[PDB]
Amino acid sequence: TCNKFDLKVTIKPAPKNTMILEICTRYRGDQDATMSILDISMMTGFAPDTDDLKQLANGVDRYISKYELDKAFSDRNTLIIYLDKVSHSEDDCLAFKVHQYFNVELIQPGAVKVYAYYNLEESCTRFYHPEKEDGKLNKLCRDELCRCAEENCFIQKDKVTLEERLDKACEPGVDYVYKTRLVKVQLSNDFDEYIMAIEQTIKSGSDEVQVGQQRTFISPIKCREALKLEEKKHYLMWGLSSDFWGEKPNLSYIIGKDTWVEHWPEEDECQDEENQKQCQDLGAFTESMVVFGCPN
Amino acid sequence: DEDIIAEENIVSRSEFPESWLWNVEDLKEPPKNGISTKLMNIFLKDSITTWEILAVSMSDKKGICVADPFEVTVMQDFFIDLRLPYSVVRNEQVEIRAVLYNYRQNQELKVRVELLHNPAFCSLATTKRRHQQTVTIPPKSSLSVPYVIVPLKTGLQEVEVKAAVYHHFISDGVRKSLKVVPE
Amino acid sequence: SPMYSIITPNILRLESEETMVLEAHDAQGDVPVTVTVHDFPGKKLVLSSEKTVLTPATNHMGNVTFTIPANREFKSEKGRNKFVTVQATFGTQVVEKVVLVSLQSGYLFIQTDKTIYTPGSTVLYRIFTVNHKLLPVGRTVMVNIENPEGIPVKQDSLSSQNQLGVLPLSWDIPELVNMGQWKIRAYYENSPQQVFSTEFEVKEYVLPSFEVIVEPTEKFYYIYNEKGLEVTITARFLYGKKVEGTAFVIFGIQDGEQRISLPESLKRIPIEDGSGEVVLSRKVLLDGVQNLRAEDLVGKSLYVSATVILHSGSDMVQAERSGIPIVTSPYQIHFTKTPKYFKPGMPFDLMVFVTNPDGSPAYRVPVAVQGEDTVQSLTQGDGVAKLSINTHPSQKPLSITVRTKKQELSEAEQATRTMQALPYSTVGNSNNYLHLSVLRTELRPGETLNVNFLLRMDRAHEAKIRYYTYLIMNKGRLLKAGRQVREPGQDLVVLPLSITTDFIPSFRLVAYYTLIGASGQREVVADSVWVDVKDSCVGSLVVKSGQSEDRQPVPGQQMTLKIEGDHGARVVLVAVDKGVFVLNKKNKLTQSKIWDVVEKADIGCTPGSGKDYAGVFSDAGLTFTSSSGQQTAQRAELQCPQ
Amino acid sequence: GRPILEVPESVTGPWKGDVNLPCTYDPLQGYTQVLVKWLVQRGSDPVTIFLRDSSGDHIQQAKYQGRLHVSHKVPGDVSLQLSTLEMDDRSHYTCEVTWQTPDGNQVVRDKITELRVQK
Ligand SMILES: *[C@@H]1O[C@H](CO)[C@@H](O[C@@H]2O[C@H](CO)[C@@H](O)[C@H](O)[C@H]2NC(C)=O)[C@H](O)[C@H]1NC(C)=O
Ligand SMILES: [Ca+2]
Secondary structure, three states: OOOOEEEEEEEEEOOOOOEEEEEEEEEOOOOOEOOEEEEEEOOOOEEEOHHHHHHHHHOOOEEOOHHHHOOOOOOOOEEEEEEOOEOOOOOEEEEEEEEEOOOOOOOOOEEEEEEEOOEEEEEEEEEEOOOOOOOOOOEOOEOOEOOEOOOOOOOOOOOOOHHHHHHHOOOOOOOOEEEEEEEEEOOOOOEEEEEEEEEEEEEOOOOOOOOOOEEEEEEEHHHHHHHOOOOOOEEEEOOOOOOEEOOOOOOEEEOOOOOOEEEEOOOHHHOOOOOHHHHHHHHHHHHHHHHHOOOO | OOOOOOHHHOOOEOOOOOEEEEEEEEOOOOOOOOEEEEEEEEEOOOOOOEEEEEEEEEEOOOEEEEOOOEEEEOOOOEEEEEEOOOEEEOOOOEEEEEEEEEOOOOOOEEEEEEEOOOOOEEOOOEOOEOEEEEEEEOOOEEEOOEEEEEEOOOEEEEEEEEEEEOOOOOEEEEEEEEEEEOO | OOEEEEEEEOEEEOOOEEEEEEEEEOOOOOEEEEEEEEEOOOOOEEEOOOEEEEOHHHOOEEEEEEEOOOOHHHHOOOOOOOEEEEEEEEOOEEEEEEEEEEOOOOEEEEEEOOOEEOOOOEEEEEEEEEOOOOOEOOOEEEEEEEOOOOOEEEEEEEEOOOOOOEEEEEEEOOOOOOOEEEEEEEEEOOOOOOOEEEEEEEOOOOOOOEEEEEEEOOOOEEOOOOOOEEEEEEEEEOOOOEOOEEEEEEEEEEEOOEEEEOHHHOEEEEEEOOEEEEEEOHHHHHOOOOOOOOOOOEOEEEEEEEEEEEOOOOOEEEEEEEEEEEEOOOOEEEOOOOOOEEOOOOEEEEEEEEEOOOOOEOOOOEEEEOOOOOOEEEOOOOOEEEEEEEOOOOOOOEEEEEEEOOOOOOOOOOOEEEEEEEEOOOHHHOOOEEEEEOOOOOEOOOOEEEEEEEEEOOOOOHHHOOEEEEEEEEOOEEEEEEEEEOOOOOOEEEEEEEOOHHHOOOEEEEEEEEEEEOOOEEEEEEEEEEEOEOOOOOOOEEEEEOOOOOOOOOOOOEEEEEEEEEOOOEEEEEEEEOHHHHHOOOOOOOHHHHHHHHHHOOOOOOOEOOOOHHHHHHHOOEEEEEOOOOEOOOOOOOOOOO | OOOOEEOOOEEEEEOOOOEEEOOEEOOOOOOEEEEEEEEEOOOOOOEEEEEEEOOEEEEOOHHHOOOEEEOOOOOOEOOEEEOOOOHHHOEEEEEEEEEEOOOOOEEEEEEEEEEEEEO
8 A cells, every 4th residue: 555655657659669658646644745756667678758857857846867867868767856845735747758769579567656755665656568557467366376477378379280289298297188168258357267178188187177077267368369269169278287276176277378279170160171181180189199198 | 699698607696694704713823922813714705795894802811802893895896786675565566676787997888687587476587588688887887677576475585687798707696585475 | 006907999899809908007027917808797707718917028018818709698688788897907906897798790791793683583692701800700691682662582591601701692583573672681690780781673674785974074063153064975885886866964953852853954965976065054943943042052962864865766775963062162171080179288180171062082172270371281182181270278169160272263162161179188187188190191001100199298297207008999909009118308209100901991099198196196198099091902802804915805705814812812703794784883892882881880989089088098999997996988889979 | 212103283185186194203222113003083982994014004994995005115104195085084093103122012102183175
């Protein structure tokens, strides 16, 4: 809880890739706080407008140091705006242009922190980001504990030759291999839900699941469109032991960077000059696993 | 990359006691002008700071004597200062700065900094993709590098960051603990 | 008819050696002496040991050196004060004295490796067990860890026996724990009523990367200074480099414990090249108070608070300087080192102590008596100047006023203090006196010191004064006693006394002569002087970069420390990161703390002289007793009057 | 008599610049110099910053490393030179010399100067 400060921070696109950062702060116990500090860090590969800063600094009530001003666009990822005061009658709001100068993937949330000079503990910190809002990193929590969802949606992508499948499913902790019909797709905001019914166990393991039984699969919301699954349809699924969720007999599975999810064409739909190869190979994959069993 | 020390070959400074050399000797070696001399060999810890060494002596004939403080400064041209807080709450997001310093008198340095990955922390660092920036630090100057993390496990957990400079055999690592607290 | 006399200390220590000083005056041939110690009321004899012989070969001045041991009888009348009867038999004649005893076995000193700790960390501490000469002793000690609300939570009982007076002990601070000022509390088993403590703080923190020093340009504030109060902020990295950043400084007035902040004083300055200045305006200060009269602020103090944030924002730190006194003068004058008794008709020496308002000595500062023109002397490094006035032979109490006469200052800026002195009363109005003097110089061991014995008595009896008896008290025990010879006609004579390390941190010279004057009147005349040796260790100790000299070492690199000190001595070490001291720097163990404890334990209460002879001896910490019935009055109080 | 130290009551120096605190004595027979010591009065009371002996020169407080030098040419000259004065250097400095007499005993003389720093 932000005991002594309300902090509201937004990032919005400009009316290579510049943006508008808006900082809205005010303080609790309605006589204005004295000298206060706004400590701002940038999104990886962003820098403020030298002008907008000089603009902010020159209007009295606020101070931005010469040392911060003489800094280069080359390396200015932190920044401190000093405020002569901040009450709560309203919100004291400011905004400046942040320019991207280094196009790298992912990009890390920025952060804003407020406090008065004479007490650092009593502070408020909000994180900002374009594709996440409120800046929170993709985690996946139930009850008490989280998992880092910031990672690949599932073993990624074109040729998928028989070796490539037969090989990749005998690595470290490949604990299960199922053919699955998808029985219900319980969407939601925070985390998705895919009830897969196990059509057969190709490789069993750390979970004695019987054929006909259903198992829930969780996946982050930001993966929804990339997985793009639909009910009634069959699948192929790798997965590890470190991917489970909750105690026996109620063991939920998680889809992460290490899981293989593959669309399996239906029985009659196999006979098509576009699904010819995949159907044969997925069929070949099964028998090699059943009759032989990873010749490790 | 080219002309930079590999991440695996960088050994991270880790021993950061607030206090040490809590330690006893007797001046046994025979006197020379009433004065005995001991030579103590020590290993200095990893902190980049100034140790204030203090000695008290107790003597049958001469009693109790408190030496004057003698300071030792431990120092490097290039190094990281990982600035962690004392505790962090579980599943709450925090920023932590990893400041980089440069004291070469007339030379800037290309540096590749990096946050390491840990199962106990959620951050852009994952087991198969590194989380490295590449910054330029002007001479007689420092740079903050902000890393955002989310603490998952409880108890005493470890944040660690490394840095290597381009075109020089210079580099540093730091491994500090912080405390993870339940809800 | 011979007078047998005996001098011992006002209070006597248990289990330690003490000296009792035998004399027969106007005696003939060998006069053998037994000396016995019993407990007081209801007797059982604790030291019958020690007899001696008084010979003309030594002009009948001997000593017996005894030790009273601890007994069950000394610990079965607790809460009230212990006592003994000290009994000398000079052949056949007996002289006795009841003498206070103390169980105070010596001192204890507690050392903690840090000044501030966090929950989950261990406290490392040592206890130094010494006696009243600061030598190591093996005794049983009781040790308590005490939490911020006053509760024992760990107890311990150790013996520093075979341990070179060092007791290493530790305590693990639990994870769930009361933040605040914890306490360590040690005392000797035998003397539970004397407790030695140390604080340490338990807090949640991380070490800062830099340090902040906030210093006023003058060590005080003068109310007539138009410029206000100049303060310098110095910020510096703990590895030695300078700091760039921003500082918020803010001032406040303190009156006793009432802290009244001055919000209108708050500034925000840049710290460039590790430095920055800031002034508290005199207008702001006077307008921050409601009493507003500028002289109503004299005696209060000013404090400054600085927060410094680096331009990185990645770390900040706070620092405060306190107790900047508001003064009308840059000086104070003290008469704590001047005896408060004069000898009518003789000179009166004055040891004026001049301090700066924070209490430190003011080197090379002139002082003079009010009414005296010309008559001035400069103060020494220890901030004491000597002056002397001639006193008129009446019993009229002396009222002395001393001023600073420092050029550069106005006259309202000069310091002043007044003191009164009473006349030493002689036996039957005989006007017989003795005056000891010493030269004004900072005295170190190794030096020779000339003690002047000046006589003053009628010519009709002076020819009988063949010798002066003198004694040297140091650290509450008798250190040395001898005779200073004198031949008839001599008024002044000098004892050339050699100052050894045994004289630290200071000492008393008491001296006396005796005769049969006027009638069958037995007369004692005494005087004493308090002399201040320069403080330092008795031996020495130095840690230095043993690896000969220079360079700045790298993290984890090997290096050689060179410890140098007294042969045989046990040396204990600690290395503390200077960051700790940025958070907390209170109660660190210091050699000048040790002496300051030692001088606070003094059984002498007066810088010299007295109302009479029996006053002279007792004020100095001594008992005098004789077969003619001349004696010091009973001392029953274990502590100096106040 | 024993040797005698000469040290100015005060010295003044340019901020950011250099300064010299003179400490000189006329040598005497039977008085070997065996130790030089400079202390700084850290407000309360004093703390050894420099140290010269048979072994060599010794800086015993880190804020002086690099900035501190004590004359060593003319016998009798043990003056102290600080470089790059910081406001924090403002303080009392004590020069203390220790001689040995042929029999063995040591004798000590010291003197205090007040260093000032002018902006
Ligand atoms: C009590 O008795 C003797 C006098 O003989 C003193 O002890 C000796 O003192 C002389 C110097 O005056 C030394 O040469 C000896 O080494 C000492 N011997 C002993 C037995 O310790 C002693 O100082 C006298 N007590 C006092 C305080 O005067
Ligand atoms: Ca002293």
